[PDB]
Structure formats: C-alpha cells, structure tokens
Amino acid sequence: GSSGSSGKKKKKKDPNEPQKPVSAYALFFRDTQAAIKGQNPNATFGEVSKIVASMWDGLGEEQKQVYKKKTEAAKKEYLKQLAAYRASLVSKSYTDSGPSSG
Numbered sequence: 001g002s003s004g005s006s007g008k009k010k011k012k013k014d015p016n017e018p019q020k021p022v023s024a025y026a027l028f029f030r031d032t033q034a035a036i037k038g039q040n041p042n043a044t045f046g047e048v049s050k051i052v053a054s055m056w057d058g059l060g061e062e063q064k065q066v067y068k069k070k071t072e073a074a075k076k077e078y079l080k081q082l083a084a085y086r087a088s089l090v091s092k093s094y095t096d097s098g099p100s101s102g
Contacts, residue, residue, distance in 0.1 A: 018082045021074035024067040025056050032056075 004010070022030060029052050036048045043051070056064075 017085055018078055020078050021071065024064070024071045027067045027070055027074075028052075028056050028059065028063075 021027070029049075032052045032055055033048050036051050037043060040048075059067075
C-alpha cells in the first residue's frame with residue numbers, strides 16, 4: 001500500500017531524461033541551500049547562495065575532497081544510466097505530423 005495525500009500537484013511539472021550531476025562545490029550547495037531556505041524562507045535565492053558560498057569556502061579538506069570524489073562517480077554513472085533512457089526512446093517514436101515542424 002503506497003499512495004499520496006497532499007494535493008495541488010505537490011510536484012512541479014518536470015521533464016524526463018536524466019540530468020548531469022552538479023560539480024563538487026555544487027553537490028554541497030544543493031545539500032546546504034535546502035537547510036538555509038528551509039530555516040529561513042525569508043531569504044531570496046541571492047541570499048541563500050551568498051550564505052552557502054561562505055560555508056564551502058570554509059569546509060574541511062576531507063569534506064571538500066569527498067565531494068569531488070562523488071562528482072567523478074556521479075557524472076560517470078549519469079552517462080551509463082542515460083545511455084539506457086534512450087533504449088526506450090529509440091523504440092516506437094517519430095512520425096506524427098504536427099506543430100513539431102512544418
């Protein structure tokens with residue numbers, strides 16, 4: 001048994017296909033930002049960021065290196081997983097004639 005409860009979508013319409021992973025410093029941004037905005041919803045994108053930049057600039061060598069090791073591992077897989085997402089697209093598609101082109 002698994003279903004939703006909240007309404008109003010709750011999941012902003014998002015496209016398909018896998019998206020390349022963020023860089024090292026970025027990997028720590030998507031993890032901190034949430035902690036920033038979540039605690040201070042009064043701060044704007046510009047603020048939430050200006051705050052993180054200061055955090056990463058003061059991260060331990062062990063914390064920075066780890067984030068980098070995850071990138072190479074993330075980007076790599078992203079290519080393998082993506083190379084598959086197409087395996088489905090290459091099957092049954094095209095031919096329809098519409099606003100796409102013409």
